[PDB]
Amino acid sequence: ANTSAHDFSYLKFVYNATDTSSEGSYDYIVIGGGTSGCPLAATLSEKYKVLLLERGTIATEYPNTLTADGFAYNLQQQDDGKTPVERFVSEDGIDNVRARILGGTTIINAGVYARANISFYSQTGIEWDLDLVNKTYEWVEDAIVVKPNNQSWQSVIGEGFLEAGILPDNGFSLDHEAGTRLTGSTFDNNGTRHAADELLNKGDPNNLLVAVQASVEKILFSNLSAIGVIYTDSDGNSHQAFVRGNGEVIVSAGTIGTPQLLLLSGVGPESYLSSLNITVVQPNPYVGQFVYDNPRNFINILPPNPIEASVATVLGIRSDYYQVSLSSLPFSTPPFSLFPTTSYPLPNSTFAHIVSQVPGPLSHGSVTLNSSSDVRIAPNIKFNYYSNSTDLANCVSGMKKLGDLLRTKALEPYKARDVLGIDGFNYLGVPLPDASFETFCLDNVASYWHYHGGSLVGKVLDDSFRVMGIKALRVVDASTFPYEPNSHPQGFYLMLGRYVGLQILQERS
Ligand SMILES: Cc1cc2nc3c(=O)[nH]c(=O)nc-3n(C[C@H](O)[C@H](O)[C@H](O)COP(=O)(O)OP(=O)(O)OC[C@H]3O[C@@H](n4cnc5c(N)ncnc54)[C@H](O)[C@@H]3O)c2cc1C
Ligand SMILES: *[C@@H]1O[C@H](CO)[C@@H](O[C@@H]2O[C@H](CO)[C@@H](O)[C@H](O)[C@H]2NC(C)=O)[C@H](O)[C@H]1NC(C)=O
Ligand SMILES: *[C@@H]1O[C@H](CO)[C@@H](O[C@@H]2O[C@H](CO)[C@@H](O)[C@H](O)[C@H]2NC(C)=O)[C@H](O)[C@H]1NC(C)=O
Ligand SMILES: *[C@@H]1O[C@H](CO)[C@@H](O)[C@H](O)[C@H]1NC(C)=O
Ligand SMILES: *[C@@H]1O[C@H](CO)[C@@H](O)[C@H](O)[C@H]1NC(C)=O
Ligand SMILES: *[C@@H]1O[C@H](CO)[C@@H](O)[C@H](O)[C@H]1NC(C)=O
Ligand SMILES: OCc1ccccc1
After folding, report:
1. Closest-lying ligand to the alpha carbon of 65?
2. 180: annotated binding-site residue?
3. 335 CB less than 6 Å from ligand 7?
4. Which alpha helices (H) appear in 11-105, and where do they start and end?
5. Looking at the chain, which terminus has fewer C-beta neighbours within 10 angstroms, N or C?
């Protein structure tokens, strides 16, 4: 793609759920207009009538989502129930965020684009059409992805990774490969955000109807088949929508949304649903189970001279750790989730946020219901950070190479004092301390935001993403896989939306 404004042509078929029919009928119903939901609804609309339902509002109502400068603002903003960012604290005690807006998480993310690790396709066991996967990537890339310009700090970090030994230089590539590279960005060179909601423009306007502020409460069932959905609007009125012959309901509500909805619909572990007075429709002990979040571990350096704020574009990739940095302006209001707690020091000037990601992870928790009736009340979530010791070992290696990174001649001009050690840097929060690095990771863990699981392929779904037992029901979002496709997963899930959509249209033909 090239540099342009955010395309809002799709708004002609966007309605508030208050202005939709009491009893609707469509060929396909997609729940959650997010990273996978938006391309899925658009792909299916090329031949059949599609309803896309979204609990959040349209992005124009919150303009700071549409720029690179306003990334922190959305996290800084108070969660009133209507805002595009929803705040939650996991049972682990770590602050986190999720999207509540048309376009989904792509509207509020750091904008880093990357294609999946090629080994991911083979290790899943699913028989992927590799040629179609690549064409789908190109389809996403020609719409919302650009080659980023040179950024002073990002180029410093890129030069630092190579000096630290993360080899080789891959140059500009979208592929998740070992070494250092400039990757793709969904922020354009003009600073305009380009997200999943723009892929709705690529679907047929006569077939697709998008309903914002549509709080999907329950999936309806009748051999067991999914017949439709119940969703409530701004006014509180219940609506019903149903699928036609050979049509399907697909759940794209996310890692948190999808398992919560499935459990509310009576699809989950038997004894658990019975303990909540929910009529069990389909027993499956894996709904809400196996929920993962990759650990973020970080250091903040405060350079003596001001540095230009930048979007994350240059990645340092190894098998056991994924590394990147983001330079930011200072703030008096803390951006929620960026740091694990609100009890955290505020930056006095422009700072560099330098992070490392643990692959997997092998540590897992669950999504469980807090309310047995209301979908608007957020479910309980636990990740069990570093419950597995291999994840802690992978952090140790990552902190060591971040240590190596600070020792580079590339990052040398950003030291406050001209001293041999890395204490020459000024730090916001906790600096780098073999047993000493274990404690640093356990105490100063943040969420990388790349959480996945809850409705796994091979546990809840088959190899074609259909929920086991139930006919005419599928799940396409981040809840589907137990491990990461790459360091930054949006690119995979944007592709996955169209991919499954194209597979469904193949079946019908
Ligand atoms: C702050 C942040 C920064 C990130 N940075 C990057 C990055 O730089 N690069 C990258 O590749 N990835 C990044 N990620 C991770 C990545 O964006 C997500 O893992 C991914 O987009 C999840 O997509 P999804 O489709 O599964 O869920 P979403 O995109 O969230 O889609 C789900 C949609 O369903 C809606 N919904 C939920 N329940 C219901 C319901 N009952 N009825 C109707 N609608 C419902 C939600 O409001 C949401 O809009 C970031 C994530 C966060 C939070
Ligand atoms: C360059 O950046 C600016 C700001 O991101 C864009 O200005 C927006 O333009 C649309 C109409 O095209 C308006 O609805 C918005 O209100 C503008 N935003 C702001 C913050 O002023 C501009 O479109 C971008 N241009 C290109 C070619 O990418
Ligand atoms: C911004 O805040 C940091 C917070 O610590 C200050 O960094 C310290 O600076 C002194 C020298 O003035 C060092 O002896 C300390 O070791 C630094 N602390 C850490 C944790 O690294 C920094 O000085 C502040 N900025 C300004 C301009 O005063
Ligand atoms: C798919 O894309 C990757 C790079 O993204 C390339 O190396 C590979 O050869 C492609 N495969 C096919 C089957 O087109
Ligand atoms: C890609 O995935 C494989 C497992 O399928 C893993 O061993 C490898 O480390 C990954 N590559 C990178 C560069 O992370
Ligand atoms: C970590 O996960 C692996 C999965 O292969 C498993 O063998 C082991 O039980 C876990 N280890 C710990 C220490 O929890
Ligand atoms: O993934 C890039 C990133 C990491 C941490 C904070 C902001 C952006």
Report:
1. 2
2. no
3. no
4. 37-44, 71-76
5. C
- Closest-lying ligand 6 atom to the alpha carbon of residue 390: 1
Contact (CB, 8 A) for 458 and 479:
no
Whether the CB of 138 sits within 6 Å of ligand 4: no
Residue closest via CA to ligand 6's atom 5 equals 362
Ligand 6 centre distance from Cα of residue 461 (Å):
24
Tell me the HSE value of 215 on the side-chain side, using a 13 A CA sphere. Answer: 17
The fold for domain 8-145+191-293+363-385+448-509 equals FAD/NAD(P)-binding domain (3.50.50)
| C-beta separation of 184 from 146 below 8 A | yes
Count of beta carbons in the 10 Å neighbourhood of residue 435 = 7
- Cα(182) to ligand 3 centroid in Å equals 32
* Ligand 4 atom index nearest CA of 137: 5
CATH fold for domain 146-190+294-362+386-447: Cholesterol Oxidase; domain 2 (3.30.410)
Report resolution in angstroms.
2.8
Please indicate whether residue 50, judged by its CB atom, sits closer than 6 Å to ligand 7: no
User: Method used for this model?
Assistant: X-ray
Alpha-carbon distance values, 199 to 126, 163, 195, 250, 316 (Å): 26, 39, 8, 18, 29
Contact present, 428 and 400 (Cβ < 8 Å)? no
Atom from ligand 6 closest to the CA of residue 391? 1
Q: Are residues 33 and 191 in contact, defined by beta-carbon separation less than 8 angstroms?
A: no
